[PDB]
């Protein structure tokens, strides 16, 4: 069976313009396990992004956390771009401070 990823984009700590933080993209609820996840800074791929080791929930669906150190400002936009076999085209979810 194939299950489409849920995606949440958010920071490790509440965002303070100019203070070092972590940008997270948590992808979950997906199956099978192969997935393409990028963090974007103003539409462009950020490079040195890490992720958790592959695990899965009680319903067998996989989850991963992708994260990078970042410093929020009013200027820069951030997003997460996800591709999975279930998605016709990659999915882009913008980082909203309030979510």
């Amino acid at each position: 069976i194939q299950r489409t990823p849920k995606i949440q984009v958010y920071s490790r700590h509440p965002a303070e313009n100019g203070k070092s933080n972590f940008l997270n993209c948590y992808v979950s609820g997906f199956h099978p396990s192969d997935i393409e996840v990028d963090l974007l800074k103003n539409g462009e791929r950020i490079e040195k992004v890490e992720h958790s080791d592959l695990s899965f929930s009680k319903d067998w669906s996989f989850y991963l956390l992708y994260y990078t150190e970042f410093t929020p400002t009013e200027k820069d936009e951030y997003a997460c771009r996800v591709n999975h076999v279930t998605l016709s085209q990659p999915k882009i979810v913008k980082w909203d401070r309030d979510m």
Binding site: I1, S28, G29, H31, S52, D53, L54, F56, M99
Partner: protein, 276 residues
């Protein structure tokens, strides 16, 4: 104050791209503590929590050998299951297993678990009696017959009542400063006008451990289940978790709404209101 140990094994075939990748991770509650990945440049069971690093070389050798043997056996299982379902050699398939034990505040076995899934569907599970199997279909019946013959259930019972409980108790003691520390959520309510007529109240819980939490909105003391947008609990990346619950409320009715938070780290369950 009950606790769980679980291992999660994922083997995935990738015809044309080498042999099936085998990954194993081990958790106590929501804390990952070991991992193995057959794709690693030099595969070995590796620590992922400070409190397991004190285990000696004989520990690491045992866990690595098991993982290497598993990498081989899972590839054999995947070929077998491909046959059981009359599937082509061209498709990718996944086999997953999750097993382990739950212990009560006194450290006694509450129950053991062992379940497997093929391509995301339940395949075969050890029953709560630790002595019989539940097979999802006629393919899993072939596995069940093999395992019955090999006296697998008896092996699982011995492990689950024995080493699983014993080592979970050791890990809980070695990592007591974190594994046995519940961090309560830092909570707040934010208000976001949607329109002249409505606003969103969002109840936040941050920095909590373990992940288990309950966040609810009430209006005039009635739970707002159907109307609450609840996001999946999510990791912060520093061991802790985050969650929020949102409701859309008519303008000027905000004070009829209360956010309720339950978490084991909290001296008392919280009632929160928007404080303008």
């Amino acid at each position: 104050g009950s606790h769980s140990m679980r291992y999660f094994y994922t083997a995935m075939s990738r015809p044309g791209r080498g042999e099936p990748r085998f990954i194993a991770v081990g958790y106590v509650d929501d804390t990952q503590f070991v991992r193995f990945d057959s794709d690693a440049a030099s595969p070995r069971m590796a620590p992922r929590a400070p409190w397991i690093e004190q285990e000696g070389p004989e520990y690491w050798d045992r866990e690595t050998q098991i993982s290497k043997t598993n990498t081989q056996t899972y590839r054999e299982s995947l070929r077998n299951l491909r046959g059981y379902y009359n599937q082509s050699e061209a498709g990718s398939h996944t086999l997953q297993r999750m097993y382990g034990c739950d212990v009560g505040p006194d450290g006694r076995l509450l129950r053991g678990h062992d379940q497997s899934a093929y391509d995301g569907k339940d395949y075969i599970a050890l029953n709560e009696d630790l002595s019989s199997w539940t097979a999802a279909d006629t393919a899993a019946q072939i596995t069940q017959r093999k395992w019955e013959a090999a006296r697998e259930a008896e092996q699982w019972r011995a492990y689950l009542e024995g080493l699983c409980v014993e080592w979970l108790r050791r890990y809980l003691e070695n990592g007591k400063e974190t594994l046995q520390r519940a961090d309560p959520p830092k909570t707040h309510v934010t208000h976001h006008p949607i329109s002249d007529h409505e606003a969103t109240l969002r109840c936040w819980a941050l920095g909590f451990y373990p992940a288990e939490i309950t966040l609810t909105w009430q209006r005039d003391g009635e739970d707002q289940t159907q109307d609450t947008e609840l996001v999946e609990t999510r990791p912060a990346g520093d061991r802790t978790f985050q969650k929020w619950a949102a409701v859309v409320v008519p303008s000027g009715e905000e004070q009829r709404y209360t956010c309720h938070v339950q978490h084991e780290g909290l001296p008392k369950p919280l009632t929160l209101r928007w404080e303008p």
